[PDB]
Design a protein around this ligand. Structure first.
Ligand code: BGC
Ligand code: BGC
Lengths: 479, 478
């Protein structure tokens, strides 16, 4: 039994502060009408991204050109390469929308993030060899098809290729950007005579879509709502004008095509996104000003920072923390996502969880009325983030004409942000005006995803291998 | 959650396998042993209710009725902890349902070593400032309050509590030996607050009552955490230590909530399947020879058992050869999160376990070592679960409950990995049921309601009713 929401009476809050809360409410509220307008623009930009001219939204073809039917069977590998860890996963598809996993994880030695190309790929291969040797001590009938989640910006002219465009997350390995990483990993596999074929390179959201669709046939989208944000869905080849002239005959106009949207870049021009002066500051102070605008409005990573800047603004205008030492509130990113999470979770009318948090982490003694403001603020910023995120869901559903859908979701915000599911479901209900009483009955609803970067990569490897074995294309002509 | 790892032992050398099988032998509790334990446990529960008494206190809770779920009204709960107090307003909606409004206050740090008036006046102040908020122009009835005061305390009636001894490092002059209820009540009065303290309870009693109010199948309340306790309803005719002391309106057939305090079961060290490691734990504890059942079922000791086994295996040449095991020598360095993280590890190479040992204990392990350590964490969590359900079985069997919800709370039941599955399989091994889904077990643990808040408030509701009516809530004369 988790506690009921606190009542959260505002009766005792001073007028001077109540006016400021009201100011922040008006500022952070996203109306049904504003959401539906954002969605309209979002749809144009999803289409723009697929067009020969392209757009701000990458809309990257994932080269998965069929839906998993759930009937697939067999043993497939996945490799998930993170910044600190890699996971090797063996997936046996049971052919009734079911699967079994056997998996290892290996911590990436600090060295590798800045070492040589051969060192990165030999370490990966050595992990693969240790894994395969244990699970297949007799060796193997046919090699194992492997799907490789390489979640770094890469371009693909076909699924079994991935040309690194730019390392992220502290990786500084020379000689890899501009090159196809698939042969790099494959030749280290070969050097160790490990029976594996690397057949697919994917982004993890694409894996999220496909794995969840294999187990849940109502899945129409995979979404990540966490430190970064992304969505993936199936479009149709006839709707991807930028592939016109590039496709072999066996990838026809009505072929499905999984798209990795990379929609974190939606509305960098801020035509529709409701930027406050706080989002302005967060943007101008970020590594990349003017970029990742939709990411900056929906990601878990900025939610405490938004609160921080708001609280500082109220301190400077003389509203709160009067005669407190707030020199810790001045540090950028000192309030991470656990701040509005802990604040929203507070079950006490006197908000004692919040009291402790602000006293112990930030050395600020709050009055009860200041806490009621902090909590109101936490709610508004959690709530707006969820409301903006479902604008992406709604754009993809509307573009494709999905009147019902399971949206398979993952990431730290969906999984752990307090009341996030309730917020998202209410936002969808507001957009569509459904006459439905309970969230479990929403025509469009977010559900917990399957493991995109392990299970999804292995199912993609299954789908891919079947095409490669038949000589069906998984990329543009000639590649 | 990911599925359970496969857990192959195929690569573990013979010398290590032999030791793993040795740990298995040591830490496995068979059905039959659980049964021998359940027979002696019942004997000790009957014993604690006798005139002579026994190692198990079996304290009458002076709740002499079941909640029907039909109760309605506004009630307060006060839950005094060592660091914090909680004040809860509970509105009962009369269909097994309730609503709460609650505040939590830090005790100023001087209260531990302050005066009697200091403690009660601060509590009353928290109450006043709570009631002033949620009731702008008072109310007609004073609010009945249930007080969870979880310090050793004797009661001849529910609306009394004589402090036996302070625990949790409290040190207040003038309280040990006196009824704390009038003490709190006169500070409430001295602040003119509309509150009537009608009940003083232990939290397990509240866990029982609150859960029975919401769930009619509740037959026991159990805490499995840092400490362990259980509470259930016996029958007044089964409480011989009460004969001659009771008024006629608490007759032979009357229900009586019992706070078992059964942590002290088997302090003689006669029946619980201790190992040499448990012996060390007991001998090195603050209270050697005390709380034997608690030492065998609390989550507090699960990592310590593991530390001692691993040390014994190091000393004996089997593991961590040429590792720096200094950190492993600190008693209680492995808290409950060790066996917990280890059991939760989803990887065949047990990487969660690897990272835990390297980062926290500076011990680098081999995969096969980690496989041992994983099997050990399992054995140890599994034994603690099976011993816990002996106490559940003992109570159920004593009362002829063939079917029961066991309303459970505490850090082990709530967070220890696969604890529910382990308890459910234990229960299934004892009774030999022919079932295949835990949701269909005749006897089963379910998540409890809030005992120390909601439960204290429901107990106030039931007590205020008897008081309003003139019905006894304690021994004759009291
Ligand atoms: O939080 C990270 C998420 O956001 C995006 O920036 C990445 O491309 C996703 O595929 C990823 O799962
Ligand atoms: O975790 C502490 C628990 O263990 C026992 O020793 C106490 O008497 C219970 O009432 C309590 O909730």
């Amino acid at each position: 039994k988790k506690p009921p929401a606190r009542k959260g009476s505002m009766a005792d809050v001073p007028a001077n502060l109540m006016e400021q809360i009201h100011g922040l409410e008006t500022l952070f509220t996203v109306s049904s009408e504003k959401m539906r307008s954002i969605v309209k623009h979002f749809i144009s930009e999803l289409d723009k991204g697929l067009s020969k001219k392209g757009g701000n939204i990458p809309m990257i073809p994932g080269w998965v050109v069929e839906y998993p039917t759930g009937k697939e069977t067999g043993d497939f590998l996945a490799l998930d390469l993170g910044g600190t860890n890699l996971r090797v996963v063996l997936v046996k598809l049971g052919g009734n929308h079911d699967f079994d996993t056997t998996q290892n994880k290996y911590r990436l030695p600090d060295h590798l993030r800045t070492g040589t190309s051969e060192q990165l790929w030999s370490f990966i291969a050595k992990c693969l060899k240790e894994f395969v040797d244990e699970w297949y001590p007799d060796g193997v009938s046919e090699p194992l098809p492997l799907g490789f989640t390489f979640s770094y910006p890469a371009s693909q002219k076909k699924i079994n290729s991935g040309v690194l465009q730019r390392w992220t997350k502290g990786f500084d390995i020379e000689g890899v950007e501009g090159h196809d990483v698939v042969p790099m990993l494959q030749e280290q596999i070969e050097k160790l005579n490990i029976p594996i074929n690397v057949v697919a390179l994917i982004n993890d959201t694409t894996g999220t879509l496909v794995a969840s669709l294999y187990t849940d046939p109502q899945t129409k989208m995979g979404i990540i709502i966490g430190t970064g944000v992304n969505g993936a869905y199936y479009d149709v080849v006839s709707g991807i004008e930028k592939l016109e002239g590039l496709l072999p005959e066996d990838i026809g106009p009505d072929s499905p095509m999984a798209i990795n949207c990379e929609y974190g870049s939606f509305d960098n021009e801020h035509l529709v996104l409701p930027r406050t002066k706080y989002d302005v500051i967060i943007d101008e102070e970020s590594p990349r000003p003017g970029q990742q605008a939709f990411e900056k409005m929906t990601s878990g990573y900025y939610l405490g920072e938004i609160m921080r800047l708001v609280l500082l603004d109220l301190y400077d205008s003389g509203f709160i923390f009067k005669d407190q030492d707030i020199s810790k509130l001045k540090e950028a990113y000192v309030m991470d996502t656990s701040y509005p999470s802990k604040i929203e979770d507070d079950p006490f009318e006197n908000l004692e969880d919040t009291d402790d948090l602000f006293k112990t982490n930030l050395n600020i003694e709050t009055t009860v009325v200041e806490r009621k403001l902090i909590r109101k603020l936490a709610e508004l910023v959690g709530t707006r983030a969820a409301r903006l995120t479902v604008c992406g869901v709604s754009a993809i559903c509307d573009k494709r004409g999905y009147k019902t859908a399971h949206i398979a979701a993952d990431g730290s915000v969906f999984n752990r942000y307090p009341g996030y599911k309730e917020k998202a479901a209410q936002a969808l209900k507001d957009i569509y005006n459904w006459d439905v009483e309970k969230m479990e009955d929403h025509p469009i609803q977010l559900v917990a995803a399957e493991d995109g970067s392990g299970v999804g990569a292995a199912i993609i490897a299954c789908l891919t291998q079947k095409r490669l074995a038949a000589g069906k294309s998984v990329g543009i002509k000639g590649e």
